[PDB]
Amino acid sequence: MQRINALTIAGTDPSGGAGIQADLKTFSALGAYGCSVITALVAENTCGVQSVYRIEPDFVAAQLDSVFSDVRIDTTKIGMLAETDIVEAVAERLQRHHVRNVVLDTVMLAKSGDPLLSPSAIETLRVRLLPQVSLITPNLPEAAALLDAPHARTEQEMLAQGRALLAMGCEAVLMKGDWLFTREGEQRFRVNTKNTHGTGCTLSAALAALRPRHRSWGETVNEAKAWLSAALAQADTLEVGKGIGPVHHFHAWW
Amino acid sequence: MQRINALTIAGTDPSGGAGIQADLKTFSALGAYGCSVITALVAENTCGVQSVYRIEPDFVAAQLDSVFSDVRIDTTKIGMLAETDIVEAVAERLQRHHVRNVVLDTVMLAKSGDPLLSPSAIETLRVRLLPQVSLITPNLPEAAALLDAPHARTEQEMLAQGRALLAMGCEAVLMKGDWLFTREGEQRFRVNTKNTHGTGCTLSAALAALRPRHRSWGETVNEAKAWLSAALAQADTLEVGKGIGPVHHFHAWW
Ligand SMILES: Cc1ncc(CO)c(N)n1
Ligand SMILES: Cc1ncc(CO)c(N)n1
Numbered sequence: 001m002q003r004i005n006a007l008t009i010a011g012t013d014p015s016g017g018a019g020i021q022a023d024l025k026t027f028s029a030l031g032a033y034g035c036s037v038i039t040a041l042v043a044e045n046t047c048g049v050q051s052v053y054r055i056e057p058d059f060v061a062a063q064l065d066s067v068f069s070d071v072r073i074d075t076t077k078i079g080m081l082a083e084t085d086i087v088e089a090v091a092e093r094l095q096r097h098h099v100r101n102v103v104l105d106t107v108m109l110a111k112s113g114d115p116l117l118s119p120s121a122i123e124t125l126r127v128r129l130l131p132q133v134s135l136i137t138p139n140l141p142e143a144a145a146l147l148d149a150p151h152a153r154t155e156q157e158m159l160a161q162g163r164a165l166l167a168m169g170c171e172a173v174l175m176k177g178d179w180l181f182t183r184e185g186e187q188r189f190r191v192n193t194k195n196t197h198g199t200g201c202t203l204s205a206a207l208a209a210l211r212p213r214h215r216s217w218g219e220t221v222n223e224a225k226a227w228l229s230a231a232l233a234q235a236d237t238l239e240v241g242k243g244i245g246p247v248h249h250f251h252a253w254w
Numbered sequence: 255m256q257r258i259n260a261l262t263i264a265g266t267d268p269s270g271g272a273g274i275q276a277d278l279k280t281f282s283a284l285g286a287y288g289c290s291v292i293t294a295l296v297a298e299n300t301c302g303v304q305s306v307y308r309i310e311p312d313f314v315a316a317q318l319d320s321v322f323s324d325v326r327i328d329t330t331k332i333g334m335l336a337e338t339d340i341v342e343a344v345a346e347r348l349q350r351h352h353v354r355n356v357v358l359d360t361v362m363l364a365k366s367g368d369p370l371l372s373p374s375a376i377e378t379l380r381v382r383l384l385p386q387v388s389l390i391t392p393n394l395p396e397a398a399a400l401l402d403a404p405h406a407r408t409e410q411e412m413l414a415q416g417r418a419l420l421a422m423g424c425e426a427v428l429m430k431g432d433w434l435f436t437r438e439g440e441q442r443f444r445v446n447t448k449n450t451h452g453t454g455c456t457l458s459a460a461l462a463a464l465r466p467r468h469r470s471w472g473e474t475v476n477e478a479k480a481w482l483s484a485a486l487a488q489a490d491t492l493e494v495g496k497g498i499g500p501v502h503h504f505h506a507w508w
Contacts, residue, residue: 001508003493014317015325016289021278024270028282031508033494035270041292041313043320050320053313059295059305063268066297066304071269071494239257240287240325253507254255254285 004212005071006032008205009064009090010079011040011107017246018044018111018198023077025249026205030227031213035071037063039090040082046197046241048112057085064093075101077208078133079201084121091128101211104129105204106138108145111197117145131169135217137204138165139176159186172217174207180221187218189225195235195245202247203228258466259325260286262459263318263344264333265294265361271500272298272365272452277331279503280459284481285467289325291317293344294336300451300495302366311339318347329355331462332387333455338375345382355465358383359458360392362399365451371399385423389471391458392419393430413440426471428461434475441472443479449489449499456501457482 006027013019020036027034039060041053067073076099081087094102108117126146130136136146143161144151152158162181165173173181178189206224214220231247238248260281267273274290281288293314295307321327330353335341348356362371380400384390390400397415398405406412416435419427427435432443460478468474485501492502 003491005494012290012292014289014291014321016278016287021288021290024275024278025282025288028279028504031504033270033492034275034279035268035494036266036275037268038266038292038295041295041309041317043313043316045320045324047324051313051316053309053316055295055307059297059307062297062305062307063295066299067268070299070301070496237257238287240259240289242324250282250285 001031001213004032004074005035006075006077006209007035007037007067007073008077008079009037009039010077010201011042011082012038013042013044013198015044015046015241015246017046017240018201019079022198022201022246022249023079023205026202027209029249029252030206030209032075032209035067035073037067039086040080044111045243046245047243049110054082057083057089060086061089061093064089068093068097073099074212075208076103077205078102078104079204080107081121081125082116083118084124087121087124087129091132094132099132100134101208102133103204103208103211104133104136105200106136106142106146108142122146126168133170134211135172135174135207136165136170137174137176137207143175162186174221180218182217189221190229191232193232193235195238196232196247197244198246199228199232202231202249255285255467258286258328259289260329260331260463261289261291261321261327262331262333263291263293264331264455265296265336266292267296267298267452269298269300269495269500271300271494272455273333276452276455276500276503277333277459280456281463283503283506284460284463286329286463289321289327291321293340294334298365299497300499301497303364308336311337311343314340315343315347318343322347322351327353328466329462330357331459332356332358333458334361335375335379337372338378341375341378341383345386348386353386354388355462356387357458357462357465358387358390359454360390360396360400362396376400380422387424388465389426389428389461390419390424391428391430391461397429416440428475434472436471443475444483445486447486447489449492450486450501451498452500453482453486456485456503
């Protein structure tokens with residue numbers, strides 16, 4: 001298979017279940033050389049977040065450039081963005097290097113629970129970043145927050161929000177309940193475990209790493225979910241942490 | 255195979271060839287769930303280091319605790335330590351949690367070239383950390399710097415330094431030219447590529463991930479080298495960077 005390099009722009013998880021740790025693992029498992037730009041450090045854990053350590057937007061920018069000025073990036077996954085300046089720096093580099101296949105997960109809350117959404121950040125995100133993502137993967141609350149609209153009550157409202165997100169620049173949207181939105185139309189798409197830490201990061205990283213090997217987003221959405229389901233299906237064979245464990249990114253190898 | 259969790263305490267490489275990126279990849283490739291504590295961020299590249307970003311020793315400490323207070327660690331690899339306070343914080347946690355199978359690579363220089371050795375750090379390292387490592391993997395210049403002795407001229411001197419490092423606390427020493435030193439005795443151990451970025455990190459991470467599946471350090475040193483050789487043997491099939499590329503951590507899977 002052709003060599004594809006994948007890049008992740010996100011936060012860190014020392015326990016290795018979420019963040020760039022999960023993104024990098026997922027890329028590896030799905031056949032892609034992995035690159036990563038850190039936007040924030042966090043003493044995280046299988047039992048929640050202990051603390052967050054901020055990084056200077058300038059260094060994030062420095063990291064982006066160290067990568068884009070040297071390695072050809074075929075797919076990109078974006079996780080935790082933290083603040084307005086990071087969002088801006090990221091969008092700017094994405095625009096300068098004509099980066100495509102950008103998958104944007106919506107990390108605007110928190111595992112332990114907490115709306116990590118800087119009101120100034122969200123506005124910058126919808127105006128400066130959205131117009132550059134190939135696929136956005138929000139759940140209902142997140143979709144609502146991005147649109148600054150009420151939490152979808154019915155299926156119709158949920159479909160309206162997907163279409164609204166497209167008009168804002170996104171090439172595609174995967175509303176997680178799962179519905180995939182494209183200019184063409186919509187498409188509809190079993191967890192038996194409690195160890196689901198990092199699922200979101202993993203799904204988005206997977207969608208990113210898989211995109212270059214498929215015809216359409218639908219095709220890639222289909223394979224990534226199948227794969228993620230297999231990862232969850234083995235989550236319990238892992239012995240990490242006392243709280244909620246991660247999925248088994250390498251179920252297919254060991 | 256029994257589940258083994260591996261932990262890396264080191265710096266970052268955004269291009270994914272060295273640092274915790276390489277460590278985490280290597281763990282993954284060799285069947286171990288990976289954990290990582292970041293000691294320093296660096297806008298690095300296949301063409302060298304652009305800049306280094308310091309992290310508060312306290313956060314390093316916070317990271318160690320987030321991990322050791324939740325995940326059972328079976329093997330540990332230590333890379334970039336940066337400064338005295340980090341070395342101290344690391345040694346302290348290693349001591350508190352009776353951490354074993356500690357593999358310490360000697361990152362006291364720089365890819366682009368530069369002795370990243372804080373004279374205060376090196377002294378703290380030999381007094382506080384060395385007594386807790388299972389295996390140290392220095393090359394000649396590094397070995398000399400740790401011993402504060404002249405660069406070994408002959409084989410005898412090289413053997414003297416290995417034995418001296420044992421007396422300082424190290425359970426084993428792998429002097430890279432390669433000689434493995436143990437209480438028992440010594441043991442002696444082809445690169446056709448130019449893309450060797452991250453080799454050192456990869457070897458140490460491999461030795462760490464492999465240790466728990468072998469009888470002795472000799473046995474594990476043997477397998478890790480064979481594996482690393484295969485990784486180098488495919489380094490050229492990768493398309494990352496313009497300078498010196500990384501090895502192919504996943505030669506065995508894709
Ligand atoms: C750094 C980071 N990014 C994303 C998530 C998802 O909850 C997390 N827990 N941590
Ligand atoms: C973070 C990091 N650790 C170790 C090395 C090896 O010189 C490197 N280039 N980068």
